[PDB]
Amino acid sequence: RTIPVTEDGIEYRWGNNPPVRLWAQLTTEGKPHGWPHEIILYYYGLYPAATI
Amino acid sequence: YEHTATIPNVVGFPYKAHIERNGFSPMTLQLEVLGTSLEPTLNLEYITCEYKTVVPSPYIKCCGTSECRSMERPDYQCQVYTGVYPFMWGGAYCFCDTENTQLSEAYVDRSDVCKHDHAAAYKAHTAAMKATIRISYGNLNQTTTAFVNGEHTVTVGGSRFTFGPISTAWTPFDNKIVVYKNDVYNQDFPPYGSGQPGRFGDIQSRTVESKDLYANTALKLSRPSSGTVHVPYTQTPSGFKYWLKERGTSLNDKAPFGCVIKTNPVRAENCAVGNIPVSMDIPDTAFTRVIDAPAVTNLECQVAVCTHSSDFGGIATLTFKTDKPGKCAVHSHSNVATIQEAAVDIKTDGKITLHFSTASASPAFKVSVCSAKTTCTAACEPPKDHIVPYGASHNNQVFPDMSGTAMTWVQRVAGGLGGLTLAAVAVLILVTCVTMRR
Amino acid sequence: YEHTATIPNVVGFPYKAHIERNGFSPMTLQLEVLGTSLEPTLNLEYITCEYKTVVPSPYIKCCGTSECRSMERPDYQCQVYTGVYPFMWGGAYCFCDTENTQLSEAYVDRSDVCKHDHAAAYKAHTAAMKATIRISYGNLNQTTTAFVNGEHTVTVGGSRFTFGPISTAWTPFDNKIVVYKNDVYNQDFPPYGSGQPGRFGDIQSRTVESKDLYANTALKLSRPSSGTVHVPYTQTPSGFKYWLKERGTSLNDKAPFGCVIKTNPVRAENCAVGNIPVSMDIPDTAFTRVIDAPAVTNLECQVAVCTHSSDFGGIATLTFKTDKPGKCAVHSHSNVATIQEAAVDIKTDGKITLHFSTASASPAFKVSVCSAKTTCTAACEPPKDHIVPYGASHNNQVFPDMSGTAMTWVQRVAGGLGGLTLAAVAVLILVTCVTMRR
Numbered sequence A: 001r002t003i004p005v006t007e008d009g010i011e012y013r014w015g016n017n018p019p020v021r022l023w024a025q026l027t028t029e030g031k032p033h034g035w036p037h038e039i040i041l042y043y044y045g046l047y048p049a050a051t052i
Numbered sequence B, C: 001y002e003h004t005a006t007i008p009n010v011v012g013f014p015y016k017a018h019i020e021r022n023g024f025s026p027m028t029l030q031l032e033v034l035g036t037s038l039e040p041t042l043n044l045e046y047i048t049c050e051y052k053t054v055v056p057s058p059y060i061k062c063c064g065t066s067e068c069r070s071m072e073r074p075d076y077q078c079q080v081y082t083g084v085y086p087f088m089w090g091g092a093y094c095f096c097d098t099e100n101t102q103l104s105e106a107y108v109d110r111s112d113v114c115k116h117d118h119a120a121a122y123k124a125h126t127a128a129m130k131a132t133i134r135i136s137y138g139n140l141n142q143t144t145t146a147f148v149n150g151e152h153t154v155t156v157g158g159s160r161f162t163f164g165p166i167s168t169a170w171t172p173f174d175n176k177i178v179v180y181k182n183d184v185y186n187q188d189f190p191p192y193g194s195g196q197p198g199r200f201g202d203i204q205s206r207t208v209e210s211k212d213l214y215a216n217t218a219l220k221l222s223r224p225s226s227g228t229v230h231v232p233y234t235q236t237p238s239g240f241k242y243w244l245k246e247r248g249t250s251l252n253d254k255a256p257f258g259c260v261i262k263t264n265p266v267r268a269e270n271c272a273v274g275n276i277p278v279s280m281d282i283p284d285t286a287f288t289r290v291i292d293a294p295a296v297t298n299l300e301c302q303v304a305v306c307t308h309s310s311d312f313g314g315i316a317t318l319t320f321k322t323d324k325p326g327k328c329a330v331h332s333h334s335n336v337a338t339i340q341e342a343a344v345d346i347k348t349d350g351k352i353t354l355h356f357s358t359a360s361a362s363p364a365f366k367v368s369v370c371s372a373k374t375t376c377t378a379a380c381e382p383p384k385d386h387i388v389p390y391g392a393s394h395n396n397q398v399f400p401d402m403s404g405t406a407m408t409w410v411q412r413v414a415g416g417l418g419g420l421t422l423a424a425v426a427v428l429i430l431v432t433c434v435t436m437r438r
């Protein structure tokens, strides 16, 4: 099964196990303080449509 | 001292409220939400459970005749049948072949364990919020519980604290609520006295101690077969068991904002939505004088490493010069980053380390140590884990600094374009001036 | 049968709903309001009563010294007084001159009869209305009680009746309600934990079984006089007794719409405001066929005497021709008058009398007897009493008939003026036509 995890996060429970809460961090393949286009990629990997 | 602050409605997050008192040394306070509870008001409508069809032994009038008698019984049926010739094991029960009647009587009654096994239909309105807050400032460290409204004040170490009303009126419960044991369902239960057989609410009772019971189960009576005493009847199955094996998941599995629904009493706890206004009444005793507080000057901020992760991935090194050791209050005047510690040890070496959490690539938060001022600038990095099991400790600010590399390139391009545009404007202005000159 | 009607929310008003069923003889129904109850939901805030100042015997430390011991008591006060030289009847209590201390201790406790004598602060919201209705139609005459909302149905002689949602959300109670015995006051009681001495709420307790008690009575301790053991103290008097002898009148004396406020539980009864929608489900058995219903023709209405008083001061004489005796349903299709009775005896004389209540000088109401039709016209008179002890039985219609004497004179004047105006218009039109013709 595939579970989408966002900034607000999820909490998944399976069987009688106690619930497990997970949150998604601000990860991406872009470079933060490099060339301009790497910065484009950085701010596109997180918040795509807004930076487009 | 009169001071108001606004805190997020998030459990496990400590807000840092800073008091700049005039004649005293600044103080930074720990506002920690340990747990909330959104408590709706329930109006019981009726009680629904499995029914019990009571079929007494039929009276068989051997060579005779009786008439049906009306009874004040819920879902009562009474059918007389003529011409019956029943049989027993030893032989024929009655005497005449066709001159006989059998009295069939059946009715619906509250089951013996509606007192145990039942579901309650409620109406939820005017949810009342109550939250648990820890106050730890200066030398004290206390926890108290208060109703979240502008009409409750609780004493904390001589202080008058009032948490003003929940920013939003949002509730996870709908108008109609059905509760079974520890589960709560957002269900449109049928109105009282209008139940259908085979569905939830087929039989309804106002109270567990109710004497009046409404039953609509479409009970039917039919001729017995020849030579048999069995009181045939066909009736709709219980809607309670149908609901039990068609209920599905409760509100706990679909509540927004990560609400945890419990019963006894029905409540929604630790919902992460809205803000909690805070009004503070701090006496003089808590504060410290600047004559006994160290004087901090020459504060510069330089940053070694910073990562904008959920936790405090930013590391800040501060340099300053003090006269005496002691304890300063540290605060971030900008939401870009939040300093993990509120008071650090201030000594002679003049250098201190701080842990801060940010969410932007180039954060610009401002740090004040005692009464000193400085600007902290950093280049934070994209972190390592796609997923972490803890929530973000920052305010989720992703706008880079006005002086960040991206904003530096944008500003350079804008400056060049504006210089070209202003040069064109000046050239055209001079040309037009010369034209009107001639 | 599907039929909806709207009735006034007035106790003792003989509202009459008429069903024109297609294949059956018309039926007129008596909807009577016997009594209502507007039932608010109460959230208890705290319990206020007289306090009790407990002053134990003072410890007198003869030629010695003690220190005050802190105690977890509401409004606790402790003071050690030095240099005391008390006296008794036989002589001096302590041995030394000024080397002595007396321990003064006092506190506030819940009075022994807060369990008996107390006032409760409430919040009122979501008032639930329940009304008592009599249904008497055809041959049946029954009374039932139902909650006034579009979600309750009660069985009346095989009929499904639902009293629809009340037209107005008006309530006599405010947000904050204070109840003392059988009186209810619309009072802004102080928030919990913010009471002032000498006023209502000086001491507050969440529940009668509460262990925590909040007390703010400004208790003060002072030196004893020389040679006396009396534990002097000055304290603010109880705000509960002040409220008791400054409460004034309760909501019963100021409630609008003639509401009668009672307690156990808090409620407002027989408020005359709004309308009560009615949805009706009548089976076939109740109605009567036109083949067995008399055929009424040639119905004219003439009126002998009529007075537009509160009661049925109008007298109507109807003439008709029937074939067989029996019982017709009579109704007024106009709100100008209301016929007192709903079914009269129909016989061969073909001459019946009706009592009706009106409020206009020249009423024009229409009367249908079985399926017949006629128009009733009368000149009603100004009545004899300035004051009567009963409410009006009409709909309070004062617009005179289109054919009344006043409207007759108005219409005559308007007709004459319009004839003159149209004559002038025609003369000018002809003149203008001739001018463009030349």
Ligand SMILES: CCCCCCCC/C=C\CCCCCCCC(=O)OC[C@H](COP(=O)(O)OCC[N+](C)(C)C)OC(=O)CCCCCCC/C=C/CCCCCCCC
Residues within 6 Å of the ligand: C396, C397, C398, C399, C410
């Ligand atoms: C010397 C000659 C004098 C002649 C004067 C005028 C005569 C002609 C009048 C009417 C002509 C008939 C056409 C209908 C239009 C007006 C209708 C009318 O009259 O009644 C309409 C309604 C029905 O009455 P109701 O009992 O259901 O409501 C009262 C509520 N209760 C009793 C419970 C308190 O009444 C209401 O609601 C009205 C509530 C209060 C209104 C105040 C404004 C005063 C104006 C009234 C209209 C008159 C027209 C004036 C000029 C006309 C030119 C000839």
Ligand SMILES: CCCCCCCC/C=C\CCCCCCCC(=O)O[C@H](COC(=O)CCCCCCC/C=C/CCCCCCCC)COP(=O)(O)OCC[N+](C)(C)C
Residues within 6 Å of the ligand: A050, B396, B397, B398, B399, B410, B414
């Ligand atoms: C020469 C280029 C000029 C063209 C610019 C055209 C603008 C684009 C128009 C529409 C875009 C739709 C997307 C919504 C905008 C979100 C912004 C926002 O919302 O900003 C927020 C607040 O900003 C402000 O307070 C105002 C400060 C900035 C405004 C003006 C700055 C001057 C120039 C702009 C630089 C950026 C554009 C140029 C870069 C491109 C060059 C290659 C950011 O703060 P936050 O983290 O709370 O936001 C995150 C949102 N959170 C946390 C709620 C999820």
Ligand SMILES: *[C@@H]1O[C@H](CO)[C@@H](O[C@@H]2O[C@H](CO)[C@@H](O[C@@H]3O[C@H](CO)[C@@H](O)[C@H](O)[C@@H]3O)[C@H](O)[C@H]2NC(C)=O)[C@H](O)[C@H]1NC(C)=O
Residues within 6 Å of the ligand: C063, C064, C095, C096, C099
């Ligand atoms: C029995 O009575 C005798 C009378 O002599 C008490 O002696 C008094 O005890 C008080 C105890 O507080 C003492 O006063 C002390 O005086 C010194 C010097 O001025 C000063 O440091 C304090 O005032 C200190 O408390 C002192 O022994 C004495 N005072 C006098 C002589 O009047 C004795 O305590 C009594 N014992 C009992 C248990 O009855």
Ligand SMILES: *[C@@H]1O[C@H](CO)[C@@H](O[C@@H]2O[C@H](CO)[C@@H](O)[C@H](O)[C@H]2NC(C)=O)[C@H](O)[C@H]1NC(C)=O
Residues within 6 Å of the ligand: B030, B136, B141
């Ligand atoms: C003030 O006290 C609370 C309650 O004791 C502290 O919370 C504890 O933190 C420690 C770690 O130092 C945990 O191991 C305990 O489990 C916590 N106790 C709880 C949650 O009941 C809190 O850290 C203190 N805050 C200060 C010092 O400002």
Ligand SMILES: *[C@@H]1O[C@H](CO)[C@@H](O[C@@H]2O[C@H](CO)[C@@H](O)[C@H](O)[C@H]2NC(C)=O)[C@H](O)[C@H]1NC(C)=O
Residues within 6 Å of the ligand: C030, C136, C141, C142
């Ligand atoms: C239906 O029955 C009720 C209860 O008997 C009647 O109410 C009474 O009417 C008689 C006079 O005929 C008197 O005892 C009182 O006037 C009424 N007593 C009350 C108010 O309880 C009522 O009149 C009948 N309703 C109908 C047929 O309209």
Ligand SMILES: CC(C)CCC[C@@H](C)[C@H]1CC[C@H]2[C@@H]3CC=C4C[C@@H](O)CC[C@]4(C)[C@H]3CC[C@]12C
Residues within 6 Å of the ligand: A035, A036, A037, A039, A040, A043, A047, A050, A051, A052, B398, B399, B400, B405, B406, B407, B409, B410
């Ligand atoms: C080096 C230069 C040329 C790179 C270009 C910078 C541009 C593309 C970057 C810099 C700052 C960025 C914005 C920062 C904040 C936000 C708010 C967020 O909710 C959506 C994305 C959005 C709106 C980003 C869009 C892309 C953005 C405007």
Ligand SMILES: CCCCCCCCCCCCCCCCCC(=O)O
Residues within 6 Å of the ligand: B426, B427, B430, B431, B434
């Ligand atoms: C920001 C720097 C300001 C200095 C502005 C310098 C002005 C540019 C120098 C030459 C301007 C001449 C352009 C006008 C065209 C001349 C021909 C004409 O007017 O017919």
Ligand SMILES: CCCCCCCCCCCCCCCCCC(=O)O
Residues within 6 Å of the ligand: C426, C427, C430, C431, C434
């Ligand atoms: C309702 C009755 C309709 C009949 C209308 C009759 C018309 C009146 C008779 C005379 C009308 C003549 C008025 C026009 C003035 C004549 C002089 C002119 O046009 O220069």
Ligand SMILES: CCCCCCCCCCCCCCCC(=O)O
Residues within 6 Å of the ligand: B416, B419, B420, B423, B427, B431
């Ligand atoms: C942004 C770079 C510096 C700004 C100055 C740019 C100089 C542009 C050259 C000036 C335009 C040529 C002058 C004659 C123009 C004309 O009148 O036709």
Ligand SMILES: CCCCCCCCCCCCCCCC(=O)O
Residues within 6 Å of the ligand: B432, B433, B436
């Ligand atoms: C933004 C476009 C122009 C609107 C603002 C007008 C204010 C400035 C005045 C215009 C220049 C007038 C001076 C005379 C020179 C000329 O005639 O060109």
Ligand SMILES: CCCCCCCCCCCCCCCC(=O)O
Residues within 6 Å of the ligand: C416, C419, C420, C423, C427, C431
């Ligand atoms: C309402 C009463 C009847 C209506 C007719 C009224 C007759 C009015 C007289 C007619 C006006 C005189 C004709 C000549 C007018 C003109 O053109 O100057």
Ligand SMILES: CCCCCCCCCCCCCCCC(=O)O
Residues within 6 Å of the ligand: C432, C433, C436
């Ligand atoms: C209400 C005032 C007049 C407005 C309505 C106009 C419609 C009727 C047409 C006017 C009469 C036109 C016929 C020609 C005769 C003329 O010129 O007077």
Ligand SMILES: *[C@@H]1O[C@H](CO)[C@@H](O)[C@H](O)[C@H]1NC(C)=O
Residues within 6 Å of the ligand: B011, B012, B034, B035, B036, B037, B269, B270
């Ligand atoms: C959730 O709520 C309870 C009480 O409201 C609280 O004690 C508990 O710590 C909370 N759980 C979380 C998310 O920490």
Ligand SMILES: *[C@@H]1O[C@H](CO)[C@@H](O)[C@H](O)[C@H]1NC(C)=O
Residues within 6 Å of the ligand: C011, C012, C034, C035, C036, C037, C269, C270
């Ligand atoms: C007022 O209310 C009660 C019950 O609501 C009712 O029984 C009583 O008859 C009413 N009084 C009047 C005005 O008739």
